[model samples]
Target chain A: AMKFLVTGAAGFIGFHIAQRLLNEGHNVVGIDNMNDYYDVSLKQARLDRLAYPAFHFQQLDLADREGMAKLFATEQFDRVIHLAAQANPYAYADANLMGYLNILEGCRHTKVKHLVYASSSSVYGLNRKMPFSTEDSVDHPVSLYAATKKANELMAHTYSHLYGIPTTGLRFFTVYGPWGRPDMALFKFTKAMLEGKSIDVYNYGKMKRDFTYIDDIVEAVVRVLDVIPQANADWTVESGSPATSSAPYRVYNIGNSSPVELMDYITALEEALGMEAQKNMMPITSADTQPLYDLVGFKPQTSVKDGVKNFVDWYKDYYQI
Target chain B: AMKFLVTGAAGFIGFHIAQRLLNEGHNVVGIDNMNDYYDVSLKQARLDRLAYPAFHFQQLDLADREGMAKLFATEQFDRVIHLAAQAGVRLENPYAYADANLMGYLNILEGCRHTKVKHLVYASSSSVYGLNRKMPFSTEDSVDHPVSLYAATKKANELMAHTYSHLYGIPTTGLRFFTVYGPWGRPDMALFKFTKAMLEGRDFTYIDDIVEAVVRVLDVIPQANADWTVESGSPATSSAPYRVYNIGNSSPVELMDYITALEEALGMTSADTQPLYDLVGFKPQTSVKDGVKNFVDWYKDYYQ
Candidate 1:
């Protein structure tokens, strides 16, 4: 069994991925700073579940350079899943940019066989282009958070190009599922409906998202683990693919091809909760995305209905509602 | 007289610009951190000359956020010349990257208001076009600095300028200076060396540079400052009149032409200097038209 180093182990996708790997008899080392960016209880709960025989969890911040170096030197991990980050787009301006740099330096020094890190759909900020291809130049970033993520991609590309590190950035689009963080739409809607509160529908119920289920995202991550990228044979800086660099680096949109309307998502939530909820419609905030994400070739094929059904089943079971 | 704020006032170009502005009956406020990236005495010497009635100098670091904000609020400048940078192509790395960001943030905040600061011409590096093989690196070239800290910081300035121009509508021009050298040029430069060595009856050897061509860059800066830029206009000058330009002598020259000129001016025998024998035949560096004549003229004017 391969020994894996998984950062953000207590995170939504990290917990699930760690559990899956542990169940398959892999020796997993998970770490999370457990920052109060989201509900800490949820992260703790995720960690509690991953307290299995094959899974080990550590409490550490990615920004702690010394701690990261020590962990790497001590563990000598086979592969790394770098999922740790300051996640909230609204909070990026206030957050320290140096934290991102610290994590990048840590990965550079460790030199793991394969580094699978989380990139976000927010990197494609303000692009009106339909079916956002990996080929499109993402020059315009709307938010400070989007800028940082883009910086990460550029920095990672530089490291991979310079140091021959096999780095992969997965641009996840609207991930929602069972055991998701309370801040997410699915959990918020579920919580609101259960409490008989009015849900705030943004863009006056006109927003669209490619909400991929947790299982599908995990599957994609697992599949990508085996497809270690090699430097592109015919790499030209002018016409080079944005997703795959001449360096052993690749970025993929791990998103559902289907784009669901915000109104439709709310309707599905109403069906799941067995209650018709009041909607407080509002104009889209500056932080919210208005356009639909198009996941063409590498689209997650999970049906929205089936995925919602699974989440609803888990929601009822988990909350006893 | 309009009150002006000049960052990097103690720097090579900043010192000259500040002196010129003061001479034109403008009230100049100069700020410099005075970090010892190079000779501190050179910076001090520059500051000593600017101790005039119209010139005010403050020993302040640009990265000190609160102090910078206070300075801006206190002395509401009518114009700003931002020439301060962790200057040099070879020093582009993480340390300088942080320094650039800090300085950039302060400059943006300081130059936010149109009434307080109407125009800004910040120093950008030629190193921004890192690996670009284009002759006379233009502002239009996609700068990809492969080998230095100086280039990245300059490119970052362009990105930061775009944001400030878009967000606050700040009229900014990023000046991508190409190999600037003169009498008070950075002591590490070839002109400084050629002058110093030639006077000592020593054969000066190094890369070629044009000093008058370098002086002409200052004219372009004032011209860019007067122009109102729009997006559809030349990309060098932007929609906000936020522009970039490569200010250099269009002509380049070899190292030997410069050395020969220095030798002629000093009336020194090349054979008298020990290093003359070691002079490896000069390879073509920057073109003769761009390099030698301006420095020769400047040397004559300054010394004669």
Candidate 2:
């Protein structure tokens, strides 16, 4: 019934978001560069799964100025969900910073109703806080990747201020489930253990993740589409600025609040695979994140065993093991 | 005593800082885009003033990746003071915004990262405090709501600097200048133009003091700014050596009142430079009355 433009539709989270929107009987269009950061075949396979009466897809780079702008011109969608950034540490400038401007420009020109996009909990950077809140100032970004994501949030807020276009940034914590990205620990550990190879673990198998399942992420995102940000009628000269503004801008962390240790996750995979696995423990690199439950009132509670089992079953069937 | 890389060497602040360094007998290298944002002749005019052997000047764009890389590869400066931008009065060059600030910033950060440069101090603006009327804005304030695109880019620079600081251990400091003014100034600025228009004398923080403040900042090397997390606040003391400071006088001066001082000065402060007096050891050599008296004496001696 509604029209939506979903960038990164071939991506793991984007794929699920697009599928859910289509299932809910909305018009959806997507664009992806389809770069080979991981397997091109996997992105293609994910794309192949998205079929619906009102679904459209395109092969294009987010950095291509003319092409990206042209898509927004002809493909008039009411809302835009931007989630594509080329996954290269070096290429972040070209795609993330420059190409992100391209996306914002398109939204500004077209007067899209609302823009909901991706930020990562990695923007938490070197913060050692137990439970991260929206009140925190995310200045320190430990990696170039984290820096670019935070840059997007600030950029989105600017466009929202200048133009009256509503913008929201969703900082997703470690998301895992069926058809997840291979770079994640769940996918890597599952594949390596199935191949009888020792799975590489960080922090000597003690690194903790607030791993929100892809289903929970999808439900939250779809529900968020209805919550169009309203301009702050209360902001005055004396309020002393916060990140939340009189502008139609908002940012929120989307995560499972419960911290799951790495060892328990591996054990879940072991139980799901019905086999024990070898381990190679490594030092911890943490992006310890927490989500605010006040906005969307549902709690994220997919059992790790159940979640890993779905991925394992999908992995086994897909790999012909 | 130390070698420095000061970007925007042809600029208002950059020129004064470079000139002061040259005066103090320090090794300094400077790079400026020399774009036609203002009069190119003005930039050339400033560059001509810094006639020192210890100083080196590059007529290079900060956006020039190859040129910037080569400079950092060879110059081997200890500290960096970044102040270049595609500047204008207001809402200028909206299209080239990302290229000027973001691209140049990335190259500079990487250049420092690879070369193992000790510290980087960049220019952020008080405009980043867009609609907020917070008194004498501190670096610890929230700068998320920026009204202009220019303001947004300045905030972005802070975030990028922190990232470089975290990743590569580059001690990056950002100065959020409120409304910097005084001699060897930018033509686009209101006061600078106002001087050409009105009976201008001088009430702004003279370039001498601003240069003095900047030198003090560059002197502090990036040690671990321990004890924090966003994980909250205190805009300084990052998990890394990244920090920002509001380089304003911390004293608000209205333009009309500032204009009043100018009129009075042309008409009467070795004393009123008190703010500049206490902080930096810049004892006023000539009061306002003394300055006007010297001006008249010079005119009478040369012509009458």
| Maximum-lDDT candidate | 2
For model 2, the docking class works out as acceptable
For residues B1-304, write the lDDT of model 1, one tens digit per residue: 7887878889877887778778778899999988787788878877998999988889887766566767778887766778777765442255455454534444444445534456666776665554445544455444432334345445656655554554456666666665565545676677766776666651221222222322233233322232432222333444343566554443334567667666665566111111111122222244443434555565566446
Candidate 2 clashing pairs, residues 3+ apart or interchain: A203-A282, A203-A283, B229-B232, B268-B289, B269-B287, B269-B288, B270-B287
Candidate 1 overall Cα lDDT vs. reference?
0.63
Q: Against the true structure, what is model 1's DockQ?
A: 0.12
Candidate 1 vs. true structure, TM-score: 0.74
What is the C-alpha local distance difference test score of each model?
A: 0.63, 0.75
Model 1, chain B only, scores a TM-score of: 0.73
Tens-digit lDDT string for candidate 2 (A1-321): 678999999999899999999999999998898988889899998999897769999998887889988999998779999889854344888778888888888898899999998988877777666566555667677788888888888788778988888998988778898888888758988877867998877777777777878898888888788788889878754552333678888888787755578888898888877899997766553332233355666667687777877888888887788
Best by TM-score: 2
